[PDB]
Amino acid sequence: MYVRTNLTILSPGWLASMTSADGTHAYEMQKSPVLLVSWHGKVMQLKVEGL
Amino acid sequence: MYVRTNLTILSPGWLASMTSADGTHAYEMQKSPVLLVSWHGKVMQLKVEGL
Amino acid sequence: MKFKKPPINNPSDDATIKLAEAAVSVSDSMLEMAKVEKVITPPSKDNTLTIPNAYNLQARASVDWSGPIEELTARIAKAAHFRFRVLGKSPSVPVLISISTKDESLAEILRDIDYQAGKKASIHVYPNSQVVELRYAKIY
Amino acid sequence: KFKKPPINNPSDDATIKLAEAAVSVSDSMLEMAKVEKVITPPSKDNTLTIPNAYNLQARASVDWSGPIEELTARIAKAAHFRFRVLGKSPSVPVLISISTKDESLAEILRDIDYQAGKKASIHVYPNSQVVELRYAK
Amino acid sequence: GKSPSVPVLISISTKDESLAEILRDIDYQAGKKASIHVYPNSQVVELRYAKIY
Amino acid sequence: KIIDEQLNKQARNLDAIYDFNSLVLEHNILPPVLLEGRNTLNLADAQSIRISDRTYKVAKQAHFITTPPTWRQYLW
Amino acid sequence: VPKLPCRVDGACDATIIKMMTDLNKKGIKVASVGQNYLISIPASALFADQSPRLNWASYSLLNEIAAFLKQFRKIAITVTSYSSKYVSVKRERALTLARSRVVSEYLWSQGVDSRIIFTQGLGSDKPITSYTLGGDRSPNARVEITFRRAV
Amino acid sequence: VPKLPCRVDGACDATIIKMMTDLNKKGIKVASVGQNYLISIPASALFADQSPRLNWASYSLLNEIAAFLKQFRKIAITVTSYSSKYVSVKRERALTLARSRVVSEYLWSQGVDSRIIFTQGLGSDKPITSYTLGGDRSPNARVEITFRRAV
Amino acid sequence: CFHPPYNNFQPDRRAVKRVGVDTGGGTVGLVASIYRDSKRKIIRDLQKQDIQYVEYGDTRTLIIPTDKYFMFSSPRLNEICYPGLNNVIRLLNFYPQSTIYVAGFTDNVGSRSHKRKLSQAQAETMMTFLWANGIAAKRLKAEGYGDKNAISDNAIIHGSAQNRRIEIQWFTS
Amino acid sequence: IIYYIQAVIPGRAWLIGSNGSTLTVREGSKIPGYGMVKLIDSLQGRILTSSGQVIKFSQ
Amino acid sequence: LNRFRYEGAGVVTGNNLRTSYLDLYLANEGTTRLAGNIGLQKLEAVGNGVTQINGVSSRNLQIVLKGDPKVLISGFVNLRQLDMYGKGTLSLYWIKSDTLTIRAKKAAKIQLAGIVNRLDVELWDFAQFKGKYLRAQRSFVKTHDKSVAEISAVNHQSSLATDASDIYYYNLSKTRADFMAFNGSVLDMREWGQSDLKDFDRYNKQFP
């Protein structure tokens, strides 16, 4: 799974990580039906579908 | 059989004994349907289910 | 003559009980580890030398944050009316900070942040020019 | 006439014991960090201070990632100061990467020397408007 | 001493005798594995395992 | 479902007590895991017993990681 | 549809605007400019004469304010306390700061889903009106809360 | 589940409460704190005037209190005696010790499942009240039992 | 009438209010007042609340739950249960010469020094509260122990919950 | 040997020694191990020493 | 010489006097200067006059004023109890005592400094007590209407105010208890300027 966002992924780890000059974060990692991030000091969960 | 407890085992003996620093005992022993233990100077029988 | 005992509360939960049973042992182990570490290594000084409190640092705060650092300290500086500077560079691995308290002032809050950062980063203050300087750990 | 109790309060024995354990472990971790963390003396920190010169108070934006020699030469030219270096140029030159929008060349040079650290440092003379880049050995 | 992996077991069934006699009986039944000592002026009761093997 | 929602309700203290990043080594490497036992005795057969005071074992060798784990991959 | 909620939980804009109207009717100052909301409360209706204490009935107003703040989604809250000039500057600043601490503590005890709360007291270091005949009765002495509605 | 008894046999909380209430109605002091339980009886229902002998009629109350005691589960039970100041220290100590010894022996003979029974008598060394007008009628003289509930 | 914040630390004019609302008869008002202010009625009210009272000879004790009457991990005191404290003051009005001891007990988990500090804080808060309630300081002394003389097991959750406690002892002469 | 301040007044201070030595110290006075007294503060329990160290309240 | 009672409205001045104990009864605004080393356990003055005494060292002393004198005393005193009913002003230098009980009725301006192991203060009205620089391990304060108390508690502080009673504490005690009935007030009123100030901890966050 390849994911592009501007959040900060915490839960599942990853292998490939890169960031643009504008803080956009791109990751490549193993498939997982979920993610967990922190927004502004609040932990939130993201549901991944389509698997 | 492997048993994890904190009491003292009497009847069928055992082959491997171990104790944690906390005060928890673990035993590897032969199979049995019953066990005899000492609780506070009082005898006690324990029935084994699902052999 | 009705007979009872003082503590009567709402019913508990068995899973919570088991969680507490684990947690008490974990906490005791951590306490013993901290004690032995303090014994073996004697501390020398304190960060308050490099982070001395001053006026207008007594405006009080209460936070609950368990995320990154940069925006948190930037908001703190903006509230304090202090010029923010960053030295070093943010590494690829993010530096995460978990903080939860109530009614702690700026000086001790910043000291706690610095201690929790530990080896990854450091904080310094300059009341002469109202400067908050955050320095990363440049190694390798 | 109505002071409601706190909504998220540990109104159970298990909850209150858990919260007490959390306080204890937080305190223990704080002690651990306190003893283990090393500090540095502000009387001995090796960070070049602000040259406090008027021409060093300008504002600019700069993005760079590469060798420092030409960068500091350009900065000195912008500040209208003579610039020179001493030492032997390392085979693999020192590299930095600064991206910034609105601050002053004083802080720029400060961070430059900080990132340089052991390999090289910089010195500023405002009496004779010069900047020196000193290498290591 | 150190508690041996094999525990020390006893069987006590008596009636209305002194603490000193109880302790002496305990020491007798323990025998070679452990011993009991008393320091009255310090009000101390001590047991010692047997250093053996 | 009941236990999961109860755990979710009682959230903050769980991470507060089970954080790992405070224990993670400087080099972004998870330190290994050790197992300790004391007062071990075994018998193989007649005329064959072995006694040891303490034993220490290494479960998982240390390795790098990008993010500290959490209670997520252990409780829910 | 039932799986993913249509709105943030506990959202009723009709109730929100109705309660804002009720507060302004009762005289609590409510104002919105852009994504930033501000609410001012005269100190006379809450505290006694130059006192760090509250009457019992003030808890009703406190509960109303907490219920309002529950609805919105925010990160940072700033509370400040202004007062008149009585004896000195330090005493007034201390009184304002203590009052701010008390109100902030009760708010945090209540279910305000915030991230950061700042408390400041300024005493009479910046007046709001040229009329200063009254003491604590004067409208200048008050408390103020500011925040930004973030997304 | 059917093999496992639903409860420890011969146990009924209602019966426990009823008998404890009846005992305190009779006038024997009963106190409960946590798992620690204490009971106290004046010597007027057990012995003659400073006598190490047991009145025959007292056996009914002895049986009742033993029946109540056996209901719970224990490890060790302590019985202590307190007396007035009559002749010396030695005489009082010996009398208290004899009383405690006899009552402990009878209790142990009765069907009580206590692993350990401790007995002692301090005579007139730790008075419970300053009112010492009466002799054996004084509430200060007494025999008491204490125990810790076993889970 | 009355004020929830302990009526601003003044004696209550309660019997006059009761007889007035009764007349709104004298005899029934008086019997209502005696029924209300009867010492045994007060003790029954304390039993109705989560407070225990123990009498034995001439020394008497009172048992208070730390969690129910305190903010968690806070030397502050919850104001919700103020009727219990009012009853405490009214009852202690009946012993105007007894000396006072107050002590606190906590659980078995955490830093022992921290436990001692918390117990001291709770005990001092209670003693100062009574001092404000109007008894001269020379008659009182506070003490917060650690976890020495437990009344229940600490390895059991409910046992520890019962264990954490506040005790008040007073003699007669 | 270490000294401490106990009672502080404008102009006059009360000094205790590690051995229990008492002292009623004015601004002009030589104090052993610390040299000469110059200035005292009522607001802050800090007294500068001619030798160059600072003496505060005990803990 | 053990006793001196002065009536006659005169001027008295003396220095370099030595004694064990003496008792003084001053009257009629006798302007009195004393510059000797004197111990004493009793002292009384009518009022409306000034009095200076340099050097006092006694094991005990008890004083209760009646009029409105202007007294200043230097030395070391172990005091027990003080009462005030007029418009008095008093000041000391050092006190090595453990138990003090102070009652104030009408007006007293008291400047005290020293060591106290236990202090009780009662203020009725128009009593301004500046016990700054007077460190006390145990402090109890009771203030009625129109009272001002500057306190220097150390470890354990108890304070109750009825209404319009101000109590400012210039030190953070390890245990604080403050209560206001109608319009009481208790404030830290500290400097905020020192570089080594300490903030609240678990055993301090008591809120007014």
Numbering used by the authors:
A (entry chain EH), B (entry chain DH): 311 to 361
C (entry chain DD): 23 to 162
D (entry chain Dd): 24 to 160
E (entry chain CD): 110 to 162
F (entry chain LC): 76 to 151
G (entry chain DK), H (entry chain CK): 38 to 188
I (entry chain DL): 42 to 65, 88 to 236
J (entry chain Df): 208 to 266
Give the text the authors published on this PDB structure.
The pathology associated with infection depends on bacterial delivery of effector proteins into the host via the membrane spanning Dot/Icm type IV secretion system (T4SS). The Dot/Icm complex of L. pneumophila is one of the largest known T4SSs. The Dot/Icm T4SS has as many as 300 protein substrates, a striking contrast to the H. pylori Cag and B. pertussis Ptl T4SSs, each of which transports only one virulence factor.
Using 3D variability analysis, we reconstructed a total of five maps that displayed differences in the way the outer membrane cap (OMC) and periplasmic ring (PR) were positioned. These maps led to the identification of an approximate 16-fold symmetry about the center of the dome positioned within the OMC. Within this dome there are 16 α-helices that appear nearly identical at this resolution. Indeed, a model of the C-terminal domain of DotG generated in Swiss Model using VirB10 as a template fits into the resolved dome density. However, we have unexpectedly uncovered that the Dot/Icm incorporates only 16 copies of DotG into the OMC dome out of the 18 DotG copies in the PR, giving rise to another symmetry mismatch within this system. Based on the structure of DotG modeled within the PR (residues 791–824) and the homology model fit into the dome density (consisting approximately of residues 857–1046), we hypothesize that DotG extends from the PR to the dome, though a physical connection between the two structures is not observed. (A) Two DotC were observed in the maps that were reconstructed during 3D variability analysis, one which contains an N-terminal extension (DotCLong) and one which does not (DotCshort). In contrast, the N-terminal extension of DotC was modeled as two relatively large helices positioned near DotG and bridging adjacent asymmetric units. Notably, this portion of DotC was only observed in either four or five of the 13 copies of DotC observed in each map. The movie shows that the OMC dome, OMC disk, and PR of Dot/Icm T4SS can accommodate various orientations in relation to each other that suggest that the complex could undergo a ratcheting motion, in which the dome and PR rotate back and forth about the central axis with the different regions of the complex tethered together by the physical connections across the symmetry mismatches.
